[PDB]
Design a binder for this molecule. Sequence first.
Ligand code: F43
Ligand SMILES: C[C@@H](OP(=O)(O)O)[C@H](NC(=O)CCCCCCS)C(=O)O
Ligand SMILES: O=S(=O)(O)CCS
Ligand SMILES: O=S(=O)(O)CCS
Lengths: 247, 568, 568, 432, 96
Amino acid sequence: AYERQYYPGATSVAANRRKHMSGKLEKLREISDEDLTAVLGHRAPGSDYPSTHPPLAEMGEPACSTRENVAATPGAAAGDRVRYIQFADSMYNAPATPYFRSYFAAINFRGVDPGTLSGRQIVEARERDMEQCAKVQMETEITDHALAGVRGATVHGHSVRLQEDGVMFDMLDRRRLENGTIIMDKDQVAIPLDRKVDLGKPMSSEEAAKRTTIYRVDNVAFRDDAEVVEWVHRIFDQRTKFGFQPK
Amino acid sequence: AADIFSKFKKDMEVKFAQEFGSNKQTGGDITDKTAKFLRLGPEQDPRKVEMIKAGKEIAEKRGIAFYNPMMHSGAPLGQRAITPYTISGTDIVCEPDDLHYVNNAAMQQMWDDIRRTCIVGLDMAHETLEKRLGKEVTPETINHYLEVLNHAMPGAAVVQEMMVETHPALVDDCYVKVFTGDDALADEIDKQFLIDINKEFSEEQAAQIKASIGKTSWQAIHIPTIVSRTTDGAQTSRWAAMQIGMSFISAYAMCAGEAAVADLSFAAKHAALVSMGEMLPARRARGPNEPGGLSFGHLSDIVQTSRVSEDPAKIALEVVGAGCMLYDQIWLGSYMSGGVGFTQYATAAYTDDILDNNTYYDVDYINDKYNGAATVGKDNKVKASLEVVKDIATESTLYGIETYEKFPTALEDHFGGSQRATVLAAAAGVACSLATGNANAGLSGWYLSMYLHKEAWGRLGFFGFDLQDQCGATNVLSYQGDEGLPDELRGPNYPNYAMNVGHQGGYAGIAQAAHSGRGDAFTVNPLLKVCFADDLLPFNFAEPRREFGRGAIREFVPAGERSLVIPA
Amino acid sequence: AADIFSKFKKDMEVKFAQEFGSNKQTGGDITDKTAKFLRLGPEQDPRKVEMIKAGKEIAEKRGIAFYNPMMHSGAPLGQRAITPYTISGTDIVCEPDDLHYVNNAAMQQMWDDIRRTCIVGLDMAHETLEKRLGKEVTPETINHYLEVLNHAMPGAAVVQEMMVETHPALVDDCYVKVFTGDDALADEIDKQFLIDINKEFSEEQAAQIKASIGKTSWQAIHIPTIVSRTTDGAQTSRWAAMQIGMSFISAYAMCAGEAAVADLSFAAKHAALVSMGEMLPARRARGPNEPGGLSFGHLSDIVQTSRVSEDPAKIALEVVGAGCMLYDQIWLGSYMSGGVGFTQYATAAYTDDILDNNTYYDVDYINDKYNGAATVGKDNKVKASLEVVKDIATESTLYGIETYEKFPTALEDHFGGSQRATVLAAAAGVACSLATGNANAGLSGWYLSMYLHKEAWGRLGFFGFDLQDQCGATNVLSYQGDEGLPDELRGPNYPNYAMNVGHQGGYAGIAQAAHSGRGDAFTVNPLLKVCFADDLLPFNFAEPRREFGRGAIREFVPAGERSLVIPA
Amino acid sequence: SDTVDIYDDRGKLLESNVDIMSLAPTRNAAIQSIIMDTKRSVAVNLAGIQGALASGKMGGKGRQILGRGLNYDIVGNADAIAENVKKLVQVDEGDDTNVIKVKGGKSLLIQSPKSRIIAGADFMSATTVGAAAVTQTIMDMFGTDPYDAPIVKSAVWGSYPQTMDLMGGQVQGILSIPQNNEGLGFSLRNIMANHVAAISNRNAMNASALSSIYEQSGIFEMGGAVGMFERHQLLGLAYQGLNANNLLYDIVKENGKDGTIGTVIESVVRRAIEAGIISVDKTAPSGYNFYKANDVPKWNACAAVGTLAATLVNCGAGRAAQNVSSTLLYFNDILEKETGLPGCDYGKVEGTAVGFSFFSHSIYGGGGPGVFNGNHVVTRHSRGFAIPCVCAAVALDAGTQMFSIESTSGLIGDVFGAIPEFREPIKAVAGV
Amino acid sequence: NVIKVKGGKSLLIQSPKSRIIAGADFMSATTVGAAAVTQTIMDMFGTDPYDAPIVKSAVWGSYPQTMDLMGGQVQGILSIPQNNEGLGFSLRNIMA
Ligand code: F43
Ligand SMILES: C[C@@H](OP(=O)(O)O)[C@H](NC(=O)CCCCCCS)C(=O)O
Ligand SMILES: O=S(=O)(O)CCS
Ligand SMILES: O=S(=O)(O)CCS
């Protein structure tokens, strides 16, 4: 029986990376089912999930061992559309970094299609399955809602200087600090919501620095986590050697 | 190095801490992590205002919708500050839009000057005249041939009666010069036709070129830009061959169309032709002399900085700039896609002295740790190894990352992860090439940078940025058929490289760096190095980055315009 | 027919019997077999004088030899008379040099207008939004999408912050319109975006088009000429697809980059794309939308004369003119060779009403012998046979030959046998197509004309003129893999046709003639026919020959010039 | 001497103690039979020809030649046409020529005798002779006038030879045309993923099996399996492609109910340690164990199996093809971070997956997983270890794609899916 | 069959028929031949991994930047398949 170790390193950043990868994330706030559906913007809150094809139980499936041995998710079974949740995360110590959101999704959720980019990270999945993953990302420490933002388009901000109130720039102003709490009053493609969503009080810069999976020279320097630099060196060496001759 | 670091900081001050147009960025500390975003929209930028006005008027005039910033989702461009770019190594401050290739005649002309150029040997042609016709080829007959050729090449007649011809005013950029590794012949060539290798290159570099090509003679042909623009790259070698054939017929009193002429044709079109680049496979089908066929070594040799500078980093950096512009803005950003395209994917590597800062830091690090290995020399280089690559590339990348982190202005500047990846990896790769004299050690450094970058920030580039970078380290020293290749011979059609921005210009700089560190005359082809050692070409290939700046400020005069035949 | 014969004779008078410039051709009978040759040289022609002066000054300025008529073997051009050309069907008298494509903005723009154009279906993209996202597509969402698209397509941003964009003043010729065989949808499209099939075509032709394409909707995309000139033809479909993708993302509030977007990409780039032409094999390697891939039916449909004329001969003759210009002057005369090129190989088919004379004689002959078979109709045609081809093509060729013999001016005009062969065979082929409604009966007539021509004069064309013509008759009705093909689907890459001047424009006219004689809306592709039924394009595809004349008199305004960013 | 036991798609033992060298495309009779049949066979759409003849719609998108209509009952004469086509396609009486009527006469399977492939440089004779046979047959059967011959010809051949292919024609094979090859030895890699899934009848593991056979036959023709690289590629073919030792099946099964990309990594690393293929090289201060591969080609094969197993689990759970691009990326990326060992193909599966993800989620090109193939610029880079997963992913899709199997590969699946060795490739290679 | 010709200045490399039987076309003769020579030189002369690209391109030339082995040292009687103008043309691409 193999116990996964996930990631090297012995700093707070490496420890936080293992927390994200293993899905051991502290719940910090609550979002209702309807508010989650509202911010995602794929259907009216509380409405039935639209479908892209009939339920598996209705149309039937080919009989092969994989379909028999691999259980379809509730979203696949229902024939849901594949929809998404996408985040931008500030490089100024947002808890999340793009690759580690994707690892979080790949390791802890079934039937997911994560994508990593510098300014955006996305999980595509059958809509109801996606909402399960979305809820954890919205509620737990993997997201600070000042330093991050749910953005399905026009994502610019991850590398831009922070606003003086500690909130990451949004071209389309979907969420901001109001009375010491983060309010989101548009969905992730910036269509105004009927009801604004309280995404809770932001982390202090101090707490963000402790919870972040990003290295920075003025918090926890990458150079100082020798194990992770060595890991890179070992992967590099081995890839180079085995490309010449796999021995 | 200190001077470049000061230049980088000045760039950040100009870009972020003093107003550009009406963006109201009237002050600030370039190390500050925070900023105020004014939500001014596109009107903060005078070029954008000009574009909006033109878009409105043209839409009204032509009767169908056109440029309109309000069609942008959510809000128009410029909700944060629209800020300028300074061309690296210069004080030329540019409107961002003026660096889009469509808006920049210098950028378009650099490509036209490459596209409309090929090199054709003379020796085979002369052997043909000697063997088949019994003709005696002398300096006199060659000089007469060259004057006939420089009449014929732009599109003028030498044999038939009742010919129409191209208007000289439309094709004034078309000409043919010659060069030769035979010093005795070079002394006899009418100087108006000669690219003098002994004059244009240092004694060491001239020796390398002449030893490489031997006592052989070559034509540097540049066909009309207006023709290149009407047609394509594959036009070039055909155009050159037609008028070479006509000029041999006329100058040597051959039958105007005999069997021996066909040998001159095959010599000019195939046997003694050197193209800028070769054809591309079906999915990206293109004939010769298109950007995808242009090997990284060939671009390094078209760029003339190696001839006029003794600074190996400067030489590499000019090639990076030229390559990022051509390969990303015109090739990948237009030929292979289009639209708004990839201006700033490229500008990150030739503006605001950020790449230069990382690179010159590396040079000092290498010189300090490796007994001046980054200074010009062939016998002061470090043996390429995994150890040396890991040392230099890791140090390079850590410094570059720390600079982005200590200067939030630099991070906002290169806002895309791909831009930062290109800069960090280019510096690391160029550094490894400089220290080792091994271009593929440079490639290894490039890929190691990407790997360190990814783990440092938990992000790298865009969705498909590191297809080649994850295939990268393992394919550097592979000798498998479609994997192995020296970087000098690699290019945009090397399978891993065939798609994605942010790389090809860097690889060209890495190829160049391996040879500039050695003081080599060329990176892979002396024929191209000499061909473009010529100030008559409209684009100054010795200063490609600065040329882009001259284009931005509308002081670059291109060839190929049609105002002569256009109404008032 | 009488009126065209009078135009022909008038053209001979203008060309030969009244002096042009200072050529001193002040009199003479156009049937005279003799002339005096004054040995005046190039100075007899005012354009040549202008060119000489320009070449002299530019050579002096740039410091290397240039245009100089004295470099011509033996003597400079014009030891006989340099005489003008009149564009057929017009009174536009041209300087011969002004009809070289390099010197003619109308010719260059015609190619650019074809090169920068592609057609992309909307239905599959709409089905993608429906199925994957559950989107409802309405005329409202389509009209919004189209306005977003016409902002985005020229090179402007709709999603990202901090984008640079193409200057609207440089790309004002770029736009996207739509057309649809769904009348109900057509009624709801904002008219600024619509190519109205019912408005632009007669009711019969509109019915044929709508029956052909069904209730399907299409985008007619024309990307910027400045981009087309910087890049190539294979650029066009990529450019179109990029901005179609961005506009669907923006207009329908998709994720800016999700799996469904890739389906839109494949649809735009492959599954719902109609190119002007397909890629070419390795020896003449080129991607899509180059002249070699442009089938004869496709050119016939790009040319818009069929829509605005009821004269089947006129419609075929305009396609011949457009084809001879494009295929011989730009394609074979530049892309595939270059230099002075093939201006007069092409002008022979669209100047001095010689081809028109032979063709209209044929129309009268056919109508008188075959109960008006050359008048517009589908049920009045003669069954294609060796009998009918032999009758029409023999009569056509004998008349044309005898006209060259009765008017020595006509013979001296078309001084090359290839020119005469193109004219005689085009007339005979168009005639056979008009009479039968069978384009390959037209091809048979073309080849028979060549065979009769050869035996009549003991000569035909240039050295390799009749490679395809000796392969011709036998390959017309072959059904072997690389031999058989309807003329409508043939093009410059049909193996026999791949090399030689004086044919491809004729074959295009022959393809058109089979369908113009029937009154057909199109020759092979309704999508191209409707795409170019649009007066916003700078080139008037309804009258290509006259447009070449507008270009010769410097009254054609091209797109894609860079004046805005060039210094004064 | 590396041997494996071959298990089928349902995890049942087929053959024990099979030398992996016997599985080489260059030695294996079943694989060579699949290659020969792929080379020598084409599908002809008879209903398409009939429609093209009647309407003039031939030669490409939008094309129609007006006024040249021929009303031939092609489909109603399908049996007589098949018979005459066989007479023309065959080289000797009673040879291995096979012409079969498909879908009630709407299409034909035309299998040239192997003699045409033996006497040919490549595989295009199947297309050219097939098209010629059909063209001649229609010309004779319906008494076409010579001046209508061009119409009958192009109904079958489309725009060839103006185009390089039979664009807008009615003849298709599993392969493309040789000129579409990006590299040398790439012909058998230019097979659309939707084709393979169609032929497999949407059986995921048989799809990845057949794809593996094609891909490795390509790598072998590329000269990418010479010397030490032969064992390297054959371990991959055996384990990832042919379910060697039931490893693929067992890993999928134990992760099938609740498994993710992440749990498949646990299965792969646990089994690799159990087999002695990898062991701890060094333990860092944090407790992190850096591993070393004791058999590098075998470790690569473990990673190859894991990549496919993760695809079957993650695409299987979603019944969605698109999950394959991220699966290939993150299985290998996360595997490297778990172990300190390089992922499959030493980064090249991960790399392929990065661009493959991008070009299946962006504006720039590509498309859904089904359009990709080993000759595609996006997905060529890995040495055969990525595309088999793509074929399996496409097979598992329940209906999320615009460019589905039916859309692109309906004719191919109908014409070729009935060939036993093609539909059951693991059983074919095992010798049943 | 591998034969030394011209006193060792060149080799004839004939692949076994099995490589042609298992192949779609004929390029396996070139790629396997070149791969065999490349591997043999790498081993025989103890080439350091960072010099492997130089040994490889001495044999393969500019492949895979070019579609052919341009500037390499391997030739056959045929060309490469992508140079075919038509379908079935490979055996026709042999210069006189
Ligand atoms: C719509 C897509 C999906 C796709 O396939 N391509 C896009 C868009 C496309 C469009 C954007 C133009 C427009 O706004 O209409 C163009 C210009 C290509 C074109 N069609 O001309 C482009 N990308 Ni993109 N794109 C870019 C970038 C990026 C970076 C931006 C990150 C940030 O924080 O701002 C991210 C990827 C990443 O996170 O790494 C990115 C994504 C995307 N890129 C996401 C949209 C993301 C968003 O919603 O904002 N681009 C860059 O990082 C720099 C270069 C820059 C390109 C323009 C230029 O080079 O000047 C542009 C290049
Ligand atoms: C993949 C391929 O596209 P297709 O899948 O064939 O449609 C290819 N495009 C590109 O590689 C475009 C690259 C430049 C734009 C993205 C840069 S990161 C091409 O058009 O030939
Ligand atoms: O967002 S994507 O990485 O697909 C495109 C970057 S320009
Ligand atoms: O004289 S040749 O027929 O070879 C060339 C005609 S332009």
